[PDB]
Amino acid sequence: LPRPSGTYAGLPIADYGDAPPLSTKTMFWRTSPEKLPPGAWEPAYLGSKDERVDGPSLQQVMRDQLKPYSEPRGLLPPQEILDAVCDAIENRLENTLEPQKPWTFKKACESLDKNTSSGYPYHKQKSKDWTGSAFIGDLGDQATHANNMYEMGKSMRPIYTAALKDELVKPDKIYGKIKKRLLWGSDLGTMIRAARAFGPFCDALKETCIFNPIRVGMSMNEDGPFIFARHANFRYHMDADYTRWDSTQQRAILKRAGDIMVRLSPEPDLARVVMDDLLAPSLLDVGDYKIVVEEGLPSGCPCTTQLNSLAHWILTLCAMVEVTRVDPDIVMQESEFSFYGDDEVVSTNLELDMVKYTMALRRYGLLPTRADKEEGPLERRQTLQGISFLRRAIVGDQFGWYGRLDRASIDRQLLWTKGPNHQNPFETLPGHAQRPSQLMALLGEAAMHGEKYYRTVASRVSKMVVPRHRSVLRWVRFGT
Amino acid sequence: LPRPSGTYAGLPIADYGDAPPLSTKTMFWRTSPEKLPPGAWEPAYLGSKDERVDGPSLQQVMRDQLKPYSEPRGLLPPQEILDAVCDAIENRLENTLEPQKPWTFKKACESLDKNTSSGYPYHKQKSKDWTGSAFIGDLGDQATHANNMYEMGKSMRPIYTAALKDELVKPDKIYGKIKKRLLWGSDLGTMIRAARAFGPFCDALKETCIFNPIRVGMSMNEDGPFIFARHANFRYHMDADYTRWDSTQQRAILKRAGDIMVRLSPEPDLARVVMDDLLAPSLLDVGDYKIVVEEGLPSGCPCTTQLNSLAHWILTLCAMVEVTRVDPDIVMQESEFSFYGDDEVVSTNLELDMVKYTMALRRYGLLPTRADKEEGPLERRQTLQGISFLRRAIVGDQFGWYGRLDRASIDRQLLWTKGPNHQNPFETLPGHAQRPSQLMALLGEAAMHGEKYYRTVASRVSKMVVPRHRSVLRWVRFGT
Ligand SMILES: O=c1ccn([C@@H]2O[C@H](CO)[C@@H](O)[C@H]2O)c(=S)[nH]1
Ligand SMILES: O=c1ccn([C@@H]2O[C@H](CO)[C@@H](O)[C@H]2O)c(=S)[nH]1
Ligand SMILES: [Mg+2]
Ligand SMILES: [Mg+2]
Numbered sequence: 011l012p013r014p015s016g017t018y019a020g021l022p023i024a025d026y027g028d029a030p031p032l033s034t035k036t037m038f039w040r041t042s043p044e045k046l047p048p049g050a051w052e053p054a055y056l057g058s059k060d061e062r063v064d065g066p067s068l069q070q071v072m073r074d075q076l077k078p079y080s081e082p083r084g085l086l087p088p089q090e091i092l093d094a095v096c097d098a099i100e101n102r103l104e105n106t107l108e109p110q111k112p113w114t115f116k117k118a119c120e121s122l123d124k125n126t127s128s129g130y131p132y133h134k135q136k137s138k139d140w141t142g143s144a145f146i147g148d149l150g151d152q153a154t155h156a157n158n159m160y161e162m163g164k165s166m167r168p169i170y171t172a173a174l175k176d177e178l179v180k181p182d183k184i185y186g187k188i189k190k191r192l193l194w195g196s197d198l199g200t201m202i203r204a205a206r207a208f209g210p211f212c213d214a215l216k217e218t219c220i221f222n223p224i225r226v227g228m229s230m231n232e233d234g235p236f237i238f239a240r241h242a243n244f245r246y247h248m249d250a251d252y253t254r255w256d257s258t259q260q261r262a263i264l265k266r267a268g269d270i271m272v273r274l275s276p277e278p279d280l281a282r283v284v285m286d287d288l289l290a291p292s293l294l295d296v297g298d299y300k301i302v303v304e305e306g307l308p309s310g311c312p313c314t315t316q317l318n319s320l321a322h323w324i325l326t327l328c329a330m331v332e333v334t335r336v337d338p339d340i341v342m343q344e345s346e347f348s349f350y351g352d353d354e355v356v357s358t359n360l361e362l363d364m365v366k367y368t369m370a371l372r373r374y375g376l377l378p379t380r381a382d383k384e385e386g387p388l389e390r391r392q393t394l395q396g397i398s399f400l401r402r403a404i405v406g407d408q409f410g411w412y413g414r415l416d417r418a419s420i421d422r423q424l425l426w427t428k429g430p431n432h433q434n435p436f437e438t439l440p441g442h443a444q445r446p447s448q449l450m451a452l453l454g455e456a457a458m459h460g461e462k463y464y465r466t467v468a469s470r471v472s473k474m475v476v477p478r479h480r481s482v483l484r485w486v487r488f489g490t
Numbered sequence: 491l492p493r494p495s496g497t498y499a500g501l502p503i504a505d506y507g508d509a510p511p512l513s514t515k516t517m518f519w520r521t522s523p524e525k526l527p528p529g530a531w532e533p534a535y536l537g538s539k540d541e542r543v544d545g546p547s548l549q550q551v552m553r554d555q556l557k558p559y560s561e562p563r564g565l566l567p568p569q570e571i572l573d574a575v576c577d578a579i580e581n582r583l584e585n586t587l588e589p590q591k592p593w594t595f596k597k598a599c600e601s602l603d604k605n606t607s608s609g610y611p612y613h614k615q616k617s618k619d620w621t622g623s624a625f626i627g628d629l630g631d632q633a634t635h636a637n638n639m640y641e642m643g644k645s646m647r648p649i650y651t652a653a654l655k656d657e658l659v660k661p662d663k664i665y666g667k668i669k670k671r672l673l674w675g676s677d678l679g680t681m682i683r684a685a686r687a688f689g690p691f692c693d694a695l696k697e698t699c700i701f702n703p704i705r706v707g708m709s710m711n712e713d714g715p716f717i718f719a720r721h722a723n724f725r726y727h728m729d730a731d732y733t734r735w736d737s738t739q740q741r742a743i744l745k746r747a748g749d750i751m752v753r754l755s756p757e758p759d760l761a762r763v764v765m766d767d768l769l770a771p772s773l774l775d776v777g778d779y780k781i782v783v784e785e786g787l788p789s790g791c792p793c794t795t796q797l798n799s800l801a802h803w804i805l806t807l808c809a810m811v812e813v814t815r816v817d818p819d820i821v822m823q824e825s826e827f828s829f830y831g832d833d834e835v836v837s838t839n840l841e842l843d844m845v846k847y848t849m850a851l852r853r854y855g856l857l858p859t860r861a862d863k864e865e866g867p868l869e870r871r872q873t874l875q876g877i878s879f880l881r882r883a884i885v886g887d888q889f890g891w892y893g894r895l896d897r898a899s900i901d902r903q904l905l906w907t908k909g910p911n912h913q914n915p916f917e918t919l920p921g922h923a924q925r926p927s928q929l930m931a932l933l934g935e936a937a938m939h940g941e942k943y944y945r946t947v948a949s950r951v952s953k954m955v956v957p958r959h960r961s962v963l964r965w966v967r968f969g970t
Pocket of ligand 2: 673735736787788789790794795796798830831832833
């Protein structure tokens with residue numbers, strides 16, 4: 011079975027791998043030597059060297075993350091519905107988005123995050139070869155070549171590098187069945203091409219985050235109250251709370267999302283070439299091998315989150331159109347959506363059979379879940395209160411709607427702080443100076459839950475100094 | 491009956507008058523020599539020299555405007571309700587407004603509109619004595635003295651100068667029963683004192699125009715959609731459409747509004763003195779005499795509109811509290827208000843007996859009116875669509891809510907343009923250059939009513955040049 015040859019984690023091997031070994035470190039440190047202890051979240055599992063527990067290798071942990079990508083896809087929504095949905099979404103974006111100028115090579119390079127890695131093949135921090143206005147040395151070569159390919163409309167095969175997310179998790183994912191989330195890291199070449207191709211559209215969409223349902227680019231504090239006020243114009247509210255959103259995606263769906271992006275781009279012919287590269291079967295470097303991934307979402311590119319939100323919008327509209335039999339453009343007259351990758355809040359005036367809705371979703375291969383369990387139809391409520399979005403609870407009072415971080419999460423940020431990578435999470439940062447500057451984003455947030463809880467959080471102690479009690483509340487809710 | 495002596499237009503004469511003779515001119519010119527003709531609004535009546543019609547003197551016209559001020563007041567709302575309402579409104583503002591720094595003399599002077607008159611006693615355009623950072627000559631003296639009085643917390647008697655509003659009106663107010671609206675022009679001294687005293691509060695309130703119901707300072711384009719989205723969170727919508735709001739006000743009500751402003755000011759002791767001057771019986775210079783006006787709203791001061799909106803809020807809450815029996819702070823949990831002087835939109839979840847509501851209002855001496863007539867309870871609707879605010883119709887679609895100028899009004903601005911004062915409205919501006927610069931605020935606005943009407947308005951002709959057809963629509967609705 012000559013190349014692609016053999017098999018890794020159920021998937022075809024296309025080549026030898028060049029990725030660096032998976033990180034054994036976390037960026038999180040304890041803020042105090044006192045113990046947590048009980049049920050407290052901690053940084054995700056760090057592998058064989060993880061003093062906290064004996065467990066499998068990070069590569070084993072990663073293989074587990076790769077399983078869903080070889081699961082069979084769910085079904086396409088009915089073709090007539092899918093087409094009608096895409097047309098409606100496309101028409102809505104046509105009416106809302108300000109046509110943009112093409113992005114230059116310069117604009118694309120500047121847009122990139124200089125603190126993250128360049129991925130294949132040099133795997134170096136982008137800032138290393140960055141003069142401030144251009145890439146130099148190795149990265150300069152990789153970037154210029156890609157840009158030349160982009161301008162000639164020539165295809166390039168993206169190469170993603172796999173990683174595991176360093177993040178706080180519930181202890182069970184450490185001390186029980188070990189789990190750590192899969193990350194896809196794009197290559198500099200692809201970042202350049204995707205940014206030139208799609209930066210214009212993504213900018214246009216972002217200027218539009220209040221009027222359109224794709225909320226990528228919103229400030230929870232500043233925009234949340236308006237977005238939520240809009241959702242509240244409608245009778246019914248729900249959140250499908252998806253499991254494994256990315257790995258359950260159909261390239262067939264991603265390609266329709268991609269078609270909309272291409273057609274709404276200022277260089278659609280150049281953009282088309284890039285998008286075809288992005289959605290073609292994916293080369294994923296897992297260290298030993300580069301394996302072929304045909305299905306699911308390939309992430310880590312600039313406009314991934316928008317692409318992913320777009321697919322979500324398509325699927326969500328498909329299910330509602332399937333179930334209610336209402337035209338997608340009419341569904342959008344009678345509803346307000348919020349999408350951020352797999353994150354969603356759906357509000358609507360329509361009478362939606364939640365059994366048929368939950369089943370339509372499942373049929374597409376998605377995994378919606380009840381806040382509790384037993385599937386078992388999704389919930390539908392008549393108030394917005396208590397629904398969540400971007401990790402905040404949506405709250406409403408006489409002044410308006412807002413997003414509020416729960417106390418658990420606020421408490422959590424008190425126990426942990428970011429700093430350089432190290433091996434033992436329980437170590438405290440030794441020169442425990444200042445959570446900036448800012449990070450009194452808690453207090454107000456903490457705040458928000460009332461004077462009683464706010465007071466106890468005012469043990470923002472260090473070590474200058476006060477107060478700032480305690481109509482920080484006024485400042486957070488209304489501001490400036 | 492020694493001073494105050496005799497009587498003018500039903501009101502006591504306190505002194506001889508110093509006001510300049512009422513204007514005989516309009517600032518409006520026709521945009522074309524073609525006739526209007528039928529039913530077309532025109533500039534209000536210009537008096538004896540008005541070639542269009544033979545009519546009474548402007549002073550007679552003004553006397554008619556003064557009648558309502560000697561009408562008996564309506565009744566105070568029940569004292570327990572009034573107190574509870576004031577407390578609730580005060581508490582709401584306490585929770586929302588950012589405490590402010592006191593305004594300096596400099597800040598107060600700069601805030602004044604330099605293009606309008608200084609009123610009593612010099613009656614000159616403010617810009618005449620304005621170096622750019624200070625008042626000089628006569629105005630400098632008047633301003634410094636007032637500021638000294640303000641700082642010593644000493645009282646001064648305001649002197650208002652009466653005028654008649656130059657504005658487009660329906661022809662019946664010209665060719666039928668002649669009518670022209672009364673204006674009160676404050677004196678520079680009082681403007682200084684009111685601005686130092688109340689500029690801080692008014693700034694604070696204005697920063698708050700989306701979260702609080704007093705909408706003074708809103709941009710219809712930018713803020714309208716959010717304000718309206720909020721109103722739309724509620725089941726029922728209404729507009730009391732008041733006749734003669736200002737002249738029907740009770741000083742007793744204005745004084746409670748004033749108390750809130752004083753208490754929320756950074757120099758409440760100094761502010762109190764000013765507010766007592768502002769609400770004490772009013773000296774109104776009508777030319778021949780200064781007459782005493784005890785009742786109704788005395789306008790023309792800086793923060794009049796906020797004071798007036800505040801009273802409106804008090805009265806509106808009183809009526810709803812009287813009728814529903816719900817606590818005012820609870821009424822505000824279940825409702826969204828918009829007030830701008832006499833202009834209002836009231837939205838609420840509560841079940842309001844519209845007969846009892848209309849009667850409560852009338853009892854306070856207000857004159858609510860049905861969009862048609864026959865009083866006859868006010869209307870209550872279950873959609874926002876079709877309600878008006880700041881002269882715009884509130885419109886909703888799949889993208890959101892917005893304010894839209896009606897076609898009549900758009901047509902109107904095509905027939906007339908502003909320019910220097912002249913005697914014959916039908917004259918066209920002879921060097922018919924450019925409606926700026928801008929004023930393509932029509933087109934988009936005109937727009938908004940669809941391509942069909944938008945096309946016909948594109949006779950924006952002059953005389954360079956195009957187009958700008960015709961997703962100006964996109965630009966007006968979403969912008970920037
Ligand atoms: O709230 C979020 C934020 C990001 N992502 C997606 O998760 C992947 C990165 O972890 C990318 O595909 C993102 O679009 C999701 S699914 N939900
Ligand atoms: O929409 C408006 C705008 C202004 N005013 C008031 O009208 C007077 C000036 O004509 C002042 O008392 C203003 O507060 C009113 S009543 N409604
Ligand atoms: Mg959600
Ligand atoms: Mg109104």
